[model samples]
Target: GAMDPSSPNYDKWEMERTDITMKHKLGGGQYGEVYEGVWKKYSLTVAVKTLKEDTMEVEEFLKEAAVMKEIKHPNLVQLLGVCTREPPFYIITEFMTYGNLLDYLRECNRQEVNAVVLLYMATQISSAMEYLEKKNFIHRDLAARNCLVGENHLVKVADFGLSRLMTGDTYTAHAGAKFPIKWTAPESLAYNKFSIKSDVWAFGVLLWEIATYGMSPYPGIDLSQVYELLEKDYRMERPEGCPEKVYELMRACWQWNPSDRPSFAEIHQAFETMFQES
Candidate 1:
């Protein structure tokens, strides 16, 4: 079955290069660039992520695409199709008009969003992570910057470049690999170990980002001092206007041991409760 190139699933998932017409560059990072484009066949707006030819091989991009195609949820970015057969290779998905959640939150102003809506956004992210957790996939990089906002305040989890499927609870990062140090968990920072729980730790920082409306984590501290301070048990302070109960949830996620962290399902439930209470 794996050798069958004419399989419906295979043909259905592969996209043609001629179908995409790039409009402009949206943004990018170490992995590659993302562009806003129109799918000419369907006349639909889409976001196309192009792998940096110099840094990434097509196989790795396909590996990510395969995993993404398996995940479908309202709170997660939807992979429409992929073009992997030639140059200008792309991973296509629905265009998120509002852009990254961190920038959206910052532009919207934190005080402008009341607690209920803030918690609602947090719930959206946890809901998606909960789906990933159930599927045994870990989003190694979980942060507001990796989330996108569409119409109606819908937040969908994005950025699968650092994600992976795991048979066990932990995965060791290869030496010399780059990670988002500020948003990473202590265990991941110290030993390059990652798991769903470690993602929960990053979720805590994401909560901090939402509560502060995109303020940088560990503000005023250099990256060099972050590890030592985390070792000393220092955690981010409650953001102004963030409810005490919500701050409590953040604290619960920052537990030293991964096992002590709350699962995404639990966090989602907590936010649901907060939403109801508010």
Candidate 2:
């Protein structure tokens, strides 16, 4: 199913089939394959996410589009348009030239990027999360891999497939869904509960990725063992060469109680302060 035609907002967000030219396949996800596309009229490059199966739930796709349409921020990936009129539904978004944050960082020289640049990237991500927090949206999956890198080393949070607008601070899921165990907060893993604070936890992991030049979190630990170790209050060691202040911020985000986690606003401010000091 698609958005109700009678809905006033539908006209503003809907895309015409003639507007986009699917160019090349970029990658695939759980529900769809992503492609590099060109907007016919604007001659602009865009990412097109096409549903892999016709039976896939279009409601979820529409929900993501609705949220994307409502928000506009420099650090958040922009949704250009969506095609629901044809057989293969398409979600068009701005294309990031450098691709995912993890891979971008992994290939960079640590000395060239420096700590300040890394902190700036973290700040950009936290800034986007702050916007989501104000909008009452929960990005259930928040990680370096979920963010895209663009010109001037800009980082924009993407991959909204697991995101949703919540009625309050928390969202509890009833359906069986897979989550990234390494990047998820303990509360989310233990109770299927997600909130801004849980996203904070994942932000800590993202910080770790940046600090370590995109090193895999908890290296050598199996996914199944992560929960067991976490139950014993284990957390990833401070990333090598990471500033003490930055590590402290990550530790603050990893606090056991969800209420104890720093809000994205606070994290954003902290990064600003850290960058100034550096």
Candidate 3:
């Protein structure tokens, strides 16, 4: 604990390394692997994200986990504890039974996952973003692959390491490098700026992800082609079985001026309206 007292917000779970058990892995995380594991001490099953070495001072470590420390929402993943006192560090969070939403969407087409369920995903993400917006937090990174799923097709948005990999290289290693090009806003790409509006740009892309059942955006379009295509006011064509109304919302998110993009509140309300109409 660092003095002045309000230390980086989280509860420390008192348990030894042996108290946790690693079962099947869920996915690859930037630092290491995420797994479905059990916390024997709490009799709780959780997702354990393995990590490499972390030499950050207590204050720095706390700051990095701050977002997880706050932000509670059913549509956002939960962080339970940080195993920092030992070697082979791990970040523990709630287990998402269905794993990452990307593979889930792909497996879904292989059906029995109804079209209305896709609509439900749209609202869940929007509602999550609305929660972040109300707190004035910018996700900076949002994508279908970054989402998670659980019982009853419940979807959750998560902040993970993709941004760390790309942003670190570019920002410190000489700039203008990598990003989720298809999901980025024009302003962020051209000016190296980020805002909630940029997130709306990515949200539009996520909508297409749901509509097409996890198909890659702008198929056959290389990373080099993104800027030229986008400069033409270009946008991806409607995804299959994508309703025109839903498609219209995607267009709204892709507006050239960031300010023109709808607020998360508006997006949530829009999805709610769409759900009610259905």
- Winner by lDDT: 1
The C-alpha stretches of model 2 lying farther than 4 A from their native spots are 1-10, 28-31
Candidate 2 per-residue lDDT, tens place, 211-247, comes to 8888999999999999879888899998778888889
Largest TM-score belongs to which candidate? 1
RMSD versus native structure for model 3: 4.9
Compute the lDDT of residue 188 as modeled in candidate 2. Answer: 86
Model 3, range 45-161, lDDT digits (tens) per residue?
998866555544454444435667667888989877767665666778888888777789999753666678899889999999898777666777798888989998999987643
Ordered list by lDDT, greatest first:
1, 2, 3
Where in model 1 is the C-alpha error above 4 Å?
Answer: 1-10, 28-31, 109-112
Model 1 backbone overlap count:
0
lDDT of each model, Cα atoms only?
Answer: 0.87, 0.86, 0.77
Clashing pairs in 2: none
Error of 3 at 137 (Å): 0.7
